[PDB]
Amino acid sequence: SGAIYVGNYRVVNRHLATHNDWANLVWEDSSRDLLVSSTTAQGCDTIARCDCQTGVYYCSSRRKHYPVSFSKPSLIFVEASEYYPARYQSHLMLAVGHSEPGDCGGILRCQHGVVGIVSTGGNGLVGFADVRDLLWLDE
């Protein structure tokens, strides 16, 4: 679990969005596993606007942060799960690191701010949904 709170927006994994997220929907994209909902309170986070390919993410299944080198946002095949059919997920970045299903929502940050959230995992792989292209989160 986990969310980004920026301005009057909350960014979560689309597959983990609550009834309240859907009732306050701003934007969602099943191909990116993202959903943004509106909030009344002002958010705590800053979004990175950069091309960093290294950063640190929070891994809830280890209660720890780990440094990672990750690929640029790309279209990657993701196998079927209980939440989605087998498909290509867009704007996804892969890295070598620990991940378990409940780790989705952990934040990835670089020196400039929030880069994205955990969205997928493999055997020693972790995938992050990028949010750096969503410029409207800042206005």
Residues near ligand A1B2J (CB under 6 A) are: 15, 33, 78, 81, 83-84, 89, 99-101, 103-104, 119-123
Which residue number, 45 or 103, has a Cβ lying nearer to ligand A1B2J? 103
Measured CA to CA in angstroms, residue 54 lies from 110, 111, 113 at distances of 7, 9, 12
- The number of beta carbons lying within 10 Å of the beta carbon of residue 121 is 18
Task: Out of 11, 16, 17, 48, name the contact with Zn ion by CB under 5 A.
Answer: 48
Instruction: Confirm whether residue 112 is marked as ligand binding.
Output: yes
DSSP string, 15-62: GG--HHHHHTEEEEETTTTEEEEE-SSPPS--B--S---EEEEEEGGG
Q: How far is the CB of 116 from Zn ion (least distance, A)?
A: 11
Which residue number, 37 or 120, has a Cβ lying nearer to ligand A1B2J? 120
Task: Out of 15, 65, 98, 112, name the contact with Zn ion by CB under 5 A.
Answer: 112
Task: Out of 59, 107, 110, 126, name the contact with Zn ion by CB under 5 A.
Answer: 110
Residue nearest to ligand A1B2J (CB): 121
Q: Which helix (H) or strand (E) holds 10?
A: strand 9-13
Q: Which residues are catalytic?
A: 15, 33, 104
